[PDB]
Structure formats: structure tokens, C-alpha cells
From a paper:
We have previously shown that the dedicated assembly chaperone [name] recognizes nascent [name], facilitates its nuclear import, and releases [name] on engaging RpL18 at the pre-ribosome. Whereas, unprotected [name] is targeted by the E3-ubiquitin ligase Tom1 for proteasome-dependent degradation, interactions with [name] and Kap104 sequester Tom1 ubiquitination sites in the [name] loop and extension. Thus, ribosome assembly chaperones can serve dual functions by facilitating nuclear import while simultaneously protecting unassembled ribosomal proteins from the cellular degradation machinery.
Crystals of the [name] [name]·[name] complex, which included the [name] TPR domain (residues 28 to 361) and the globular core of [name] (RpL4CORE) and the entire elongated loop (RpL4LOOP), diffracted to 2.4-Å resolution. The structure reveals an extensive interaction encompassing 70 exposed residues of the internal [name] loop that are sequestered by the concave [name] surface on complex formation. The longer central [name] helices αF and αG form a hinge between the N-terminal (αA-αF) and C-terminal halves (αG-αO) of [name], which rotate as rigid bodies by ∼10° from an open to a closed conformation on binding [name]. [name]-binding induces the formation of an α-helix within RpL4LOOP (α3, residues 89 to 97), which is entirely devoid of secondary structure elements in the context of the intact ribosome. The interface is formed primarily by electrostatic interactions between the acidic [name] surface and the basic RpL4LOOP. In contrast, we identified a single charge-swap [name] mutation, E266R that abolished the [name]–RpL4LOOP interaction almost completely. The crystal structure of [name]·[name] now shows that Lys56 is located in the highly conserved RpL4LOOP and is sequestered by the [name] surface, thus shielded from Tom1-mediated ubiquitination.
Author numbering:
A (entry chain B): 27 to 361
B (entry chain A): 4 to 78, 89 to 188, 203 to 272
The structure:
Amino acid sequence: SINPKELLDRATTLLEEGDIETAAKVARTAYEHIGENGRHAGAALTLLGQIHVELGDIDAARNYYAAAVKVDEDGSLPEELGGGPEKFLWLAQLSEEGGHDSVAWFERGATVLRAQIQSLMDSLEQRPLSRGQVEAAIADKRRRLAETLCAVVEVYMTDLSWEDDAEQRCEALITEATMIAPEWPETWQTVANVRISQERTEEAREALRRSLGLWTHLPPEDPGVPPFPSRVSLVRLLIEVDMEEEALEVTERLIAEDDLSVEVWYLGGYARYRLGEKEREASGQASEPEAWKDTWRSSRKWLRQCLKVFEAEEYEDERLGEHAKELIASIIGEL
Amino acid sequence: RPTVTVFGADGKPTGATEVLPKVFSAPIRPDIVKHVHTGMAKNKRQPYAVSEKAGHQTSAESWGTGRAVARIPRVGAFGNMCRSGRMFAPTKIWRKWHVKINQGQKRFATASALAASAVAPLLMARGHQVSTVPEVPLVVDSAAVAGDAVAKTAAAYKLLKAIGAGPDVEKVKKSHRQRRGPLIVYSPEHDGKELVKGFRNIPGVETCPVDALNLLQLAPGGHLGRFIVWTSAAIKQLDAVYESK
């Protein structure tokens, strides 16, 4: 009959067209004609993993990604056959234990990536089909690796923050990450994250200003622009170290991309509330003594809109919902 | 062969006609743009972050919510700063590792948003007033903007009324950040840059060249259905430009 590899390509096209339901069907039939012993078992299970992630079925996604690992335990298979390091990284995030279990998965993923990077570099000095293609592939791989190290940093500042060598391990991760991808905003974002928790605020600002300078000037669809969730984390870092002005621009772009994002309406409202507090304290020394009122007016508009979308989406972050109310009530009292 | 009629400055069909580019045939998936920017699907607690696992320890205050928490005035301790030293605790970012899929989805989303722009019910749902527009897609003869035709602001504003964009421009006049109005899409190589100098004066209307089309203008807030005024020159290239990238 038909070749199952063609079915994998078809399901991938369907997934890339946002037709997730049909992709799952085609990917399922595909795998049935491949099986666990099949040549493309790893890639097939990986794909079924991606699909169920996009569907929000985390438990199905974990089982598929886990089965993919059992087929390619060391990740040595070509990405085309075995799926690649992606399955290790997803298992780390989907880990129900988190902590050491996530780091273990991430480390396995980093190991595969580092070997692939090293292989592409050997293929570079070997006469390549295109030097530009390899360097691009190397860049992509180094960025995924850098993001993996950053992912581990964040585990040590949450799940494993009680570890004595937590700060030491983070310091080693961000040194390697800045080495391999100094042009990637997330590396410097993560450097700032560490610095903040090290009570090094000025260096945190310095790092964040650097990460922004790598993408804020790009066109909105350019591959250099960090993903939405990564930019949410950025806003939290920006408000933390008193760069609300920058946070305002970032939150406005984000809302221009998804205005049903409860957490972004909140962050933008809060960033504007904080900014209003500052301008208000400096009001006596300021030229426009009333500027802060307009800043708090927009803060109120963002927060009102946050609660509005909160209701419509039936959001479940109760503490964020109650705080938005407190902030509005507060702005009202001060006129 | 489906074709779209081109209108002159007067507001009537010039008799000429253009081939409907194939991209308008793309399937419309309303929440494709929201999907591109989503964290974890159908997560209502913290969609942009992997939840913190405290283990046998006690969870920090800032964990499990997006709200800021109170913070002590700033100038081992590292772990304590992380949990209770910050307004916003550090979070495990939800990272979508299958990058190429996400990139492909952005590419399709652009096609899907283009298609949505030529569906009147979707445009009205986004709050555009298009009952007076004679046809979608709305194509104006490039001769009406060849050079210094609509360099003047009086000439550009007059063009929008005759073409039926009037009610949507005036809508904005009630009560930068103007994704609410019509988007004028023009071909730089033929239409020039003069027309932009005339339209920039008008409030509500937005300017953009065919090659520089993005989802921010085609799908504001992640909602498909932008009111677009095409120049004849832009429509022809439109099919080639999207295939170029």
C-alpha cells in the first residue's frame, strides 16, 4: 500500500496548517503501519507527541514522548528517523515530579544537542554542500541548547532552589549559554534572572537592555523575536528591576498579538500602576505634575479589561483576579 | 478563473479586472493566530509557565499565580531571594520546542488572515463597517495612486469616500494604535511612496507595503478580518510575494 513516511509528512503539513484534529488521525494510522520496531518509530511517536501537546492532552503527549525515548534511548538516530532531542526536552517540562527528574531529562537532551552541534562542525570543515546551511543549522542547534541550559537554570531557581549548589550550577549554565549564543535574547534574559536573585540589580538591567537590543528593532514576524511565553517572563523581569517604560512597549506588542491573554492585561496594568506611583512621587519635581493621573487612568483601563477577559475566558487564577480588583479600587480612591 | 473588479478614483468600475490571487482561497481557521502565541493549550491557571514542584518542601508564595507579591526594599540567600525576595518569582518558561511547526503555523496564519480579509461577515464581526464597500477584495486602480495623485491629504480622503471606506474611517472619528481602521496595501515598486504621505494624515487608516505584511495588521489582537484596500499593482504581486518567503 502507501508508504508510511508519506503519511508522516502529510500529518506534519496538516499540523503546520493548524488542522490538528486530522493530523492526529493521519499520524495514528501512520504509526500503526510502522510499529515500535519500525524504522520511523521515533519520529512517528515524536509527531504524535507534538500533536497531543498542541491538543492540550498532556498525559497522552507524555506517553508518546516516553515511547519515543524507549525506541531511541541515547538519541543517536538521525532526527528524520528517531525524532531528535525534542522528546527529551518535552519530558523534562511534562515531568510530574519536576526538580531532579526534569534536570535529568534536560541533561539527556543537552547531551544529544551538543553531539549534533559537534557533528555539524566536523561536517563544516569537510567539504559541505552549503557552508551557509550548516552555520544556520549550527546556530539553530546552539540556540536550542542555550534555551535548554536556561530551562535548567529556572528549575534550580524554583523546584531545586533548596539545593546548596543552586547558585553555583546556575552560574555555570549562564556562562556556557552566553558563550554559545550571545546573540540570542533568552540567554541574557536568563542572566538577568540570576542577577536579580543575586541582588545585582544594575547588572540585571544591563543584561535586559542587551536582550531587548537584539529583537525590539526587528519586524514582528522575524525568527529573531522571542516566543510569546518567553516575553511574558521578560515583562516580569522588567517590572522587577524598574524598567516599566520598556515593559509598557513589550506589553502593548503582546496584546497586539493576543488580546485574550489575561496575564498580559494584568502585567500591563500593573506595569502602568507602578509607573504611575513613581511619576506621582516625582510629581513635585516634575514638569507635568498631572502626568501620573493619565498613567493611572490607562492602568485602570488595562485592569478593567483584564477582569473582563478573565470572566469571558473563565480564568482560574483567583489570586491574580483579586489583585486586579484591589489595584482598581486603589486607583479610584486616589482619583 | 475567479476575477476581482478594479475601481477608479471616481468610485465606479474602470472596466478593467484582476485575477483573484490564490492565497484568498486558503482555509480560514479563526484561532490560528491565538494558537501560535499560546503557552500550554487549555490551561487556565498559568498558561505561560511550567508549574513549580515543591516536592517534600513548602511551596513559595509567588508560585502558582501571575500576581506580583509584596517585596522588601533592596540595596544560601540565593534560594531565599528566589522564593520570597522578589516581586515576581523566577518561573519555568513554557517552551514549545518544535520550532519549525510553530514557524510553519505562522506562515499559514498569514495566508489565513489574508483570506479572512475578503469575507464580509468576518470584517463586520471585527467591527468594520463595510456595508457600503462595493466588492471584497477591494481593489483600486493603481493609476489613482500612481504618483502624486494622492500625495495630498484632500485627494486621499476623497478617494476613500468614493470607494466606500467612508463609514469605517468616520467610525474611528468617534472617541500608533489604529488597527481599527482600513489598511492600505500598496506596491512600492510601482505605486511609489507618495501616497503614504497623503494617507498618514488621515486618522484610522493604516499604511503598509505588500512585501511587509504582518499578522499585527492582518489580525489585530489575534483576530482575523482586517479591512484592506488593495492597489491593483499590489494584488498582482501579492501571490508572488507570499510564495517568495
